[PDB]
């Protein structure tokens, strides 16, 4: 699932609603 994707560990925020 996406919770498992290894990324840099930054918080992600959406750019639109």
């Amino acid at each position: 699932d996406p919770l498992d994707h290894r990324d840099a560990g930054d918080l992600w925020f959406p750019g639109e609603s």
Epitope: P2, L3, D4, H5, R6, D7, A8, G9, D10, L11, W12, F13, P14, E16, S17
Partner: antibody, heavy 122, light 108 residues
Framework: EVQLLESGGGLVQPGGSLRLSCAAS????????MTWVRQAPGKGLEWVSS????????YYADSVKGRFTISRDNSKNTLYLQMNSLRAEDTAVYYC???????????????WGRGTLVTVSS | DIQMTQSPSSLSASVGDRVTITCRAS??????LNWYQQKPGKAPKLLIY???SLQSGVPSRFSGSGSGTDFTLTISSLQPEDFATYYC?????????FGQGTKLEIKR
């Protein structure tokens, strides 16, 4: 396998200080953002602070900005909340939580510790 | 901040029942809404993320949906282990905010 365990906390006077610690096991700590959430007695959940995996980016609730500092030690798998100028607003169980934050998902508190109690009183 | 209002605050239901808990945002938050479950004397656990996606190990009787300001958590066929307090939580923006909680108790 995966575990988070909070240390620290206890009773402090208004104006006082504490340092909470959260020990991570069973995952690659440096790859994961981490969060502190608190829960006042008989009340709901309130987000306190989050920190990027790298430790470079921090985020705070307005009520704790410039009193609390979130930090981490990637070398020792440890997340901290340094607390200054405490007030009774701050009395609560504090939980650390692993925070995956995928693209087109956002932050999710997918694993939580057991909680530690902070009491602020004269 | 983005105010999250859950409805109802308190809900009594029985095993087998279908219940719906609502979560409303004070502004659009797209689908960035998570749900947590909390039993007495225990830390919360993740149930659902991004409105609809089930956490590993969460039964299919839990479903969520919504986008914008209105969201639903539906538990079909309530089981004894499901009685707990439920919170929604928006991840659209910091500060991350939670609903006030919905205490789901068992009827007898």
């Amino acid at each position: 396998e995966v575990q988070l365990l909070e240390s620290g906390g206890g009773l402090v006077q208004p104006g006082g200080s504490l340092r909470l610690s959260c020990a991570a096991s069973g995952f690659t700590f440096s790859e994961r953002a981490m969060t502190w959430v608190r829960q006042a007695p008989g009340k709901g959940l309130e987000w306190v602070s989050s920190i990027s995996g790298s430790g470079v980016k921090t985020y705070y609730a307005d009520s704790v900005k410039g009193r609390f500092t979130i930090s981490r030690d990637n070398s020792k798998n440890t997340l901290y909340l340094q607390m200054n100028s405490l007030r009774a607003e701050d009395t609560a169980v504090y939980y650390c939580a692993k925070t995956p934050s995928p693209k087109y998902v956002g932050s999710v508190f997918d694993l939580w510790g057991r909680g530690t109690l902070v009491t602020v009183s004269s | 901040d983005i105010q999250m209002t859950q409805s109802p605050s308190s809900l009594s239901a029985s095993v087998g029942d279908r219940v719906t808990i609502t979560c409303r945002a004070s502004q659009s938050i797209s689908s960035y809404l998570n749900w947590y479950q909390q039993k007495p004397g225990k830390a919360p656990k993740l149930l659902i993320y991004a409105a609809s996606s089930l956490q590993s190990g969460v039964p299919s009787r839990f479903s969520g949906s919504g986008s914008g300001t209105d969201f639903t958590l539906t538990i079909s066929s309530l089981q004894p282990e499901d009685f707990a307090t439920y919170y929604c939580q928006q991840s659209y923006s910091t500060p991350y905010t939670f609903g006030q909680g919905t205490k789901l108790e068992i009827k007898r």
